[PDB]
């Protein structure tokens, strides 16, 4: 007859229960701006190279 607390809480719950949306939103969006450095791990690489040849 209505739109109610009962239904709104249903929607709320389902929202809370839906893992796919929130996890995808955080992980996939945050996955893209991942990386910028002249790695010191690569500093190791360079140093080794210096020692290499």
């Amino acid at each position: 007859x209505x739109x109610x607390x009962x239904x709104x809480x249903x929607x709320x719950x389902x929202x809370x229960x839906x893992x796919x949306x929130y996890x995808x939103x955080x992980x996939x969006x945050x996955x893209x701006x991942x990386x910028x450095x002249x790695x010191x791990x690569x500093x190791x690489x360079x140093x080794x190279x210096x020692x290499x040849x």
């Binding site: 009962x6 719950x13 809370x16 992980x27 910028x36 500093x43």
Partner: protein
């Protein structure tokens, strides 16, 4: 002042000052929220719940699990958890100590960058570090070389460490941890067909994983005993309600580690992965690792793993050379313990991140500066 370490190795979460023998207390990193209209008006509505508080409250709460596969799923939830842990257990303010962070190795930068960003900004904290599990595992186990297996709540590891150095190429990293195994358990359990699926219902299994599991010595022979005997079968109660009694379904579970068919993947298993990763690494070192073989945490708790592991290595090793493994009592705590040691040495004063850098350069700092 004094120095404080968070363990965020998944499962219950471990936090404690440098030099205490064991963390003050420990929390699952469950997060959970209401499921039903709140109908006691007298009740205060809190919309999110965590920790043993939730562990009590569970039934109308429903769980979210903020770390998949060792990757932490939803940051603000973490922030809730983290804040709670400081204030409620620790009675601690972010300024109070350097803080040390505990990381799955070889996993996406994002966890580094946001973790540091949040904790320097949202918390404001003198010094920060993030450290790879195996290092702690060695320090606690106190053998400068080694290889570690620790399959926690989360993603499951092989790292050889030689004394004083990393072999990051050597390393193997696997999503096989006990949680997913447990969820396979239900697909077992419906054979006896007492059957329930939800998150809390899934955690109920964890107790059984404590109590009822033990490692198969030999699979065929065990099946033969399974045909012979019921001593293999033990009787256990619901946490409340029924008595339940369980057959081979107990021992069959760990074999997944040796055979991840049962939830089906190919990586040829813990042991074959290990020997593979060895045969990657170079020739001379190997004997030491044959000597020094080290295991820890969630799965390892099971009685007997080390034995069949040794059986496996005796299969794969040239028998000629010595083999042994270490199985310390305290493995599940091991990491945070090692972290305490890690905290102790003054060299991190040379080594910590400071707020100043975070001012002068971004999260990018970490990935050079830390491993």
């Amino acid at each position: 002042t004094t120095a404080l370490v968070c363990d965020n190795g998944s499962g219950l979460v471990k936090a404690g000052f440098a030099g205490d023998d064991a963390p003050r207390a420990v929390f699952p990193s469950i997060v959970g929220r209401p499921r039903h209209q709140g109908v006691m008006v007298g009740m205060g509505q809190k919309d999110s719940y965590v920790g043993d508080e939730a562990q009590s409250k569970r039934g109308i709460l429903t769980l979210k699990y903020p770390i998949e596969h060792g990757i932490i799923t939803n940051w603000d939830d973490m922030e809730k958890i983290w804040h709670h842990t400081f204030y409620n257990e620790l009675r601690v303010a972010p300024e109070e100590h350097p803080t040390l962070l505990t990381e799955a190795p070889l996993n996406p930068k994002a966890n580094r960058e946001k973790m540091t960003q949040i904790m320097f900004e949202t918390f404001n904290v003198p010094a920060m570090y993030v450290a790879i599990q195996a290092v702690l595992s060695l320090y606690a186990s106190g053998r400068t070389t080694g290889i570690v297996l620790d399959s926690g709540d989360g993603v499951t590891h092989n790292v050889p460490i030689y004394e004083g150095y990393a072999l990051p190429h050597a390393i193997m990293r696997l999503d096989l941890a006990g949680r997913d195994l447990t969820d396979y358990l239900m697909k077992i359990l419906t054979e006896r067909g007492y059957s329930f699926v939800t998150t809390a219902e899934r955690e109920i299994v964890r107790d059984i994983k404590e109590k009822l599991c033990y490692v198969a010595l030999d699979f065929e022979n065990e099946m033969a005993t399974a045909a012979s005997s019921s001593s293999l079968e033990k009787s256990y109660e619901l946490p409340d309600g029924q008595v339940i009694t369980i057959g081979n379904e107990r021992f069959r579970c760990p074999e997944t580690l040796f055979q991840p068919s049962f939830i089906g993947m190919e990586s040829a298993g813990i042991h074959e992965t290990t020997y593979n990763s060895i045969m990657k690494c170079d020739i001379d070192i190997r004997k030491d690792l044959y000597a020094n073989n080290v295991m820890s945490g969630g799965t390892t708790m099971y009685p007997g793993i080390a034995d069949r592991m040794q059986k496996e290595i005796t299969a794969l090793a040239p028998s000629t050379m010595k083999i042994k493994i270490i199985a310390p009592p305290e493995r599940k705590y091991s990491v945070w313990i090692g972290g305490s040691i890690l905290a102790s040495l003054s060299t991190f004063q040379q080594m910590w991140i400071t707020k100043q850098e975070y001012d002068e350069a971004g999260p990018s700092i970490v990935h050079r500066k830390c491993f």
